[PDB]
Amino acid sequence: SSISDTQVYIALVVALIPGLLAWRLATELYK
Amino acid sequence: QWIKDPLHVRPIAHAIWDPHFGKPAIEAFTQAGANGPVNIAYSGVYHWWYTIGMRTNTELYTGSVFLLLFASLF
Amino acid sequence: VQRGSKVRILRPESYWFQDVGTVASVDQSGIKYPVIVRFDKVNYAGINTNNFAVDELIEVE
Amino acid sequence: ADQSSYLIKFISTAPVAATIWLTITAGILIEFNRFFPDLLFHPLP
Amino acid sequence: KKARVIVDKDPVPTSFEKWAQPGHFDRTLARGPKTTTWIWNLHALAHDFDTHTSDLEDISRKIFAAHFGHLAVVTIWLSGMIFHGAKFSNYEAWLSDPLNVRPSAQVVWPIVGQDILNGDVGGGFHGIQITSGLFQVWRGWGITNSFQLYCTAIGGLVLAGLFLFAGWFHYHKRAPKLEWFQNVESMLNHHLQVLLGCGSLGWAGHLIHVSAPINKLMDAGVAVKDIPLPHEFILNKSLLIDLFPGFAAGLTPFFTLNWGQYADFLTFKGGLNPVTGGLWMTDIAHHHLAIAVVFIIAGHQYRTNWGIGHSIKEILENHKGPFTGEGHKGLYENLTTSWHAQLATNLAFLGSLTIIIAHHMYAMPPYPYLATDYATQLCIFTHHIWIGGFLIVGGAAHAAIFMVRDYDPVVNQNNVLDRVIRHRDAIISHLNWVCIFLGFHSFGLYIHNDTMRALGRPQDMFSDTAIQLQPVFAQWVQNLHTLAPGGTAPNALEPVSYAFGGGVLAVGGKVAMMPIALGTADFLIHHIHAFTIHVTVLILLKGVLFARSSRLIPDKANLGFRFPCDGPGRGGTCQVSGWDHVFLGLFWMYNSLSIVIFHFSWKMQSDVWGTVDAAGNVSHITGGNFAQSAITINGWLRDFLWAQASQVINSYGSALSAYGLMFLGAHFVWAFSLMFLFSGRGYWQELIESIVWAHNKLKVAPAIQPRALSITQGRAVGVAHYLLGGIATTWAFFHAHILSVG
Amino acid sequence: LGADLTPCAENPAFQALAKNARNTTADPQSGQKRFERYSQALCGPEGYPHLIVDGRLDRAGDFLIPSILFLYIAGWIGWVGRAYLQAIKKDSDTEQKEIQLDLGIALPIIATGFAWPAAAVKELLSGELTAKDSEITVSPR
Amino acid sequence: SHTVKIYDTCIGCTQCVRACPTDVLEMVPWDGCKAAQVASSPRTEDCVGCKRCETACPTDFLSIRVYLGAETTRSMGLAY
Amino acid sequence: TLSGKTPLFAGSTGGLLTKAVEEEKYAITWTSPKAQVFELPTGGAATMHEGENLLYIARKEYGIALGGQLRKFKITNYKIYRILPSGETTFIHPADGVFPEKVNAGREKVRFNARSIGENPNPSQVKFSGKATYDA
Amino acid sequence: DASFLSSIFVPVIGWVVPIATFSFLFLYIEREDV
Ligand code: CLA
Ligand code: CLA
Ligand code: CLA
Ligand SMILES: CCCCCCCCCCCCCCCC(=O)OC[C@H](COP(=O)(O)OC[C@@H](O)CO)OC(=O)CCCCCCCCCCCCCCC
Ligand code: SF4
Ligand code: SF4
Known about the structure:
part of a larger assembly; 9 chains; B: flat; photosynthesis (chain H)
């Protein structure tokens, strides 16, 4: 039916990349 | 499933996971041929993605991962 | 500017800017705003007098 | 009658002249709509 | 001292001079207008007699004369209602058939198609169906024909002109001194005796001689033409003895204390008359006799020119205890030197009394054919609830006006007033707490119920079939009233009201009154009432106790009763005055009483009112839906506001079309209030600046300068349209719904 | 014209509404004379007369005749109020004369108000209709 | 605290000093008006910002102005 | 530090809170010709003493409201102090010794602008500069 | 068969993120260092 478990796990691992970049940008905008 | 009948199939927004639902509520939102309780989408994203050429769930998946990397770029 | 002469206000902040007033008295003490001018209209505070300078007035005849 | 001058100055005040004048106007409109009702438009020859 | 009549002769000349002088009464208004603020100040200062004159004697004279003028207004209104019942009604057709003829006065003139409003009310008559119950009042008065109504109307007009002449007389010709007004003991004696006890004794005389015989002949089935005139019961004694055989004994059982022969016409039945659904006229007359004796005895309490009696001042001086310091020491001087303190007490207790009257007149229906006239019952209940709420708010307003203007620290020193000022933080923070507590445990249970029912979890609700909250003390009191005719009132036959218990009384196949059973929904709604009353009290008491000072603004009494603020600093001080607390308390009074009358409407339609079959089972109007629907806010919105407003929206093209028009126009006025309530006058004054520019350009400019309304007038206009629109919506809704289904 | 407009005489819905006709006034034939007047208008599909305000002289009585009549009456009213305000500014108690009207000043002004278009043209061409922008007050910019 | 500034169109009628509930304003010697006195605001730290001085001022728009600024315990008027 | 008798009242809940011991505290002193009843700014009635009086208060505005009330009792010798939690007592009203409604020499112009208010510059002329439009 | 992720992420978003976020923000707005 839907996408697999591997694709959801890969998407979460990829979403860690804008999470880290967003943390750096939000801290830079404050700095 | 919405591809083969856009006129009679209700689009799904996302799933519901809510522990506050009683069993009649869980039954009431198990709709549009879904396995569990879901919300119906009313934003027309199915009509737009179907019109511009998307046909499978994997194409929607690669779109979402591409937008994750595109947001990483910005 | 003479006593009893109709004048028109040139102070922009005033209630009666570009409106005709009547001179009540003029002080000769060298003060900055000597001319006492009276009005028929009252301002938002309910007052119809103000002190003006000679530069803030033009005679209306 | 000096009291009659006081009554005339009373009738000439704003709420009393208003209620008299608007009573006359409303009476004209009410009587015209009694005798000639239902004038949605002016009828043409 | 002593109580004597002392009167000035010709204080004020009778002249039309000051009718030509608008605002003659204030030294600031008499200079004349310079802005449009003057025009509104001429109306807001028109009756504030303390700003008129400073001396208390002239103020008291103005108040006494204005009272006579006001009584003349009320008497013109009353005799006009009686005149419409005489000339323009189906009253005589209603007497012949009270169950099938709808009461109607006010024929409407046909001009613009509005003769649709002259609906078929029955009795061969077309007109607006009335809901004030004048018909039931007149049938209880014993009036059988139109000529008696004409005589009553002409007498009311003569009494109104007599009141108006009395006001002219005691202002211009014979004006009393101040020491005349301060004989409060003499006033209380004459009021309790003559105005109340002698009035109730005279009305007992009427009920014994005129009302009960004529109403007994009406209930027996005699036609109203065959019923004799009421003076023929006094002339021909045998008619009274044929109706009430206790009149055969005469007046000698009264003086010899053999009062048992009078039990024909002085009863203690209780319950309702099964023919009319009203109280027994014998009970009503016996009530008025007993009340008459109690008030005559009660009005002998206070001392006047003959030594015996009480000083009210001495009674108040004695009532001091350990907690409360000097007790009631200064309170006599507050009520004797300030008309505002008297207006606060009389207005608050008369508003409370009017609410009490509403509850008593629904549950023990006094008038014949009032109980099965469901429309009249709903309308007089909700009417008296609104009047009582307004008068309570006025009493709080004048309490704040007393504190600002007439309060004296020297008189009110260490007494109960001085001490309630000195712990107002304790009172107000504890009332704050009671309001937050009751808001949670009243309204949050409805929110719980909405959420539980929305989540498919009906077993987790607060209902009768789930977690039960039984109003167990009120169920207990109901059971004690049902059992009272047995033991704790042996001489009563039926309970005081059937609302507590005792079976269903049916008149004309409709429920007059039946036991009002209390479940979980009644528990919830009584706590909603407790909550909204307490918040209204919080606001009004916090206005009165902080009228003079607060932590925030220490010299608030110097700023007055009615002022907008003390400016934007110290955080912002908008709405600190006593006026502004009355202002906010008006909204909360509206909120509270709207829930009160909604509770009445849906409870009486769902659990009381309805039809009775020959088998005896009762089918109610909305079908018993109050128990499961009224526990959610969705249930109120759906089964009360959506479902019962079907009659006011589907009413164009019928005789009820004016109520649909008033429903929409009241929505308009209520919405129009929000322009005033949400905005402020700096915007409006700056808009008037550009409009005044456009007038100065075309040389059409008034010398009376256009100003925006004041801050307080913006608030007053806003709350007035809020109340007018919100109450007139409920008016048109109640009327169209109950004139259809009742 | 637009959206199924027929004359009222040809429309079956108008003639169906004309039978059950409420009487507006006390005479019994107000409901019949109402539809006999409205029969010459154009008619929607439901039976109601639709007015056409575009400006043709076939339908001048719908909006053009009420327009001229209203503009005459409203110009009368506004002109008379303007003339009264300008009449009382020379009297040095002008504010008292606005809450208390002078009938001796107002009644000739309301009598002379039939010629407000001629007087308005004569005051526009003379330049006395308006004030100068430097002579009236404004706010700081 | 708030900022209270006095402009030179003062006539020295002393009404702002009388209106002030927290003693911000005082009258000092001057020579630019007939009354030979201006208002002065040395204690602006006591200023709550209620603007009674601007209500009291008779000149056409305000020889004295209060400019609301940072909030303190005194300017907010807290007894706690 | 301050000599005076507390006025006669049985206490209120409107008195002074924890700010008095932790932040700052005010006192008002006055003398009276006779013992008479006045109204507290906290609410309630109190009798002042014939002689020196002392009444601690939470805010300065309480003291100036009370001093405005004491003028109705023809009492014009009132003094307002500011007390810190260290015990530091400073004399603030009237600070000069003369009431501020009267001109006294030795006072200087504070926050005087030598222009009319319509002559203040625009906000955009003073933008990013760290100054206000009404400065100087 | 990744539908079990909701029973992790919805409690985290609803409880763990508000507690950690409001604890950080509360101790930050009460801090006197920066
Ligand atoms: C026995 C009753 C009674 C009496 C004698 C007074 C008497 C007084 N009140 Mg009072 N008051 C009352 C009830 C009463 N009130 C009630 C019930 C409330 C609560 C709603 C108040 C709330 C109240 C406040 C808050 C204030 C007063 C004030 C005053 C004083 C001045 C009144 C004045 O100038 O009139 C002026 C009256 C008007 C300008 C008329 C206003 C019109 C009303 C608001 C609209 C009515 C709408 C109508 C019912 C329906 C719509 C009809 C419409 C289409 C025409 C005066 C001593 C004022 C004062 O200064 O006290 C010293 C004041 O500030 N009262
Ligand atoms: C529907 C609108 C509404 C609501 C909810 C309130 C709410 C309240 N008003 Mg009110 N008010 C309103 C309209 C409303 N007002 C209007 C229109 C006016 C203008 C006149 C006022 C004027 C006014 C005054 C003048 C006063 C109040 C007061 C109160 C309080 C009552 C006491 C209390 O705590 O109740 C209990 C609280 C409630 C009933 C609110 C709902 C609580 C829900 C059901 C439970 C919480 C839900 C949930 C747990 C939260 C989830 C959060 C999620 C993010 C995790 C309360 C905060 C009084 C006050 O503060 O006295 C203490 C008071 O004096 N109001
Ligand atoms: C002498 C009467 C008079 C005249 C000639 C005007 C003229 C004008 N007004 Mg207006 N105005 C008046 C009275 C008058 N006003 C009054 C009494 C009010 C308060 C309600 C206003 C409120 C008002 C507003 C809010 C606005 C205007 C605007 C305007 C301009 C456009 C036309 C318009 O909107 O009219 C329509 C005006 C109204 C509907 C207001 C009510 C008019 C009343 C009913 C007429 C007054 C009759 C008068 C008292 C009779 C005096 C007779 C004398 C012999 C005793 C125009 C310059 C508009 C503007 O600036 O456009 C550029 C605008 O926005 N006026
Ligand atoms: C105003 C509405 C009442 C709401 C208050 C309820 C909660 C508040 C709790 C009170 C806190 C302290 C009160 C003052 C503290 C105080 O002064 O205490 C002392 C006071 C007696 O004072 P004294 O002994 O000095 O008596 C002297 C008197 O003459 C007054 O000077 O005792 C009470 O009043 C206790 C009454 C509690 C009030 C509840 C009774 C209400 C009556 C109910 C009757 C209605 C009919 C019921 C029919 C079933
Ligand atoms: S001007 Fe208005 S908003 Fe401002 S403090 Fe005064 S009342 Fe409040
Ligand atoms: S804002 Fe208030 S405290 Fe400040 S100077 Fe003006 S009146 Fe005084």
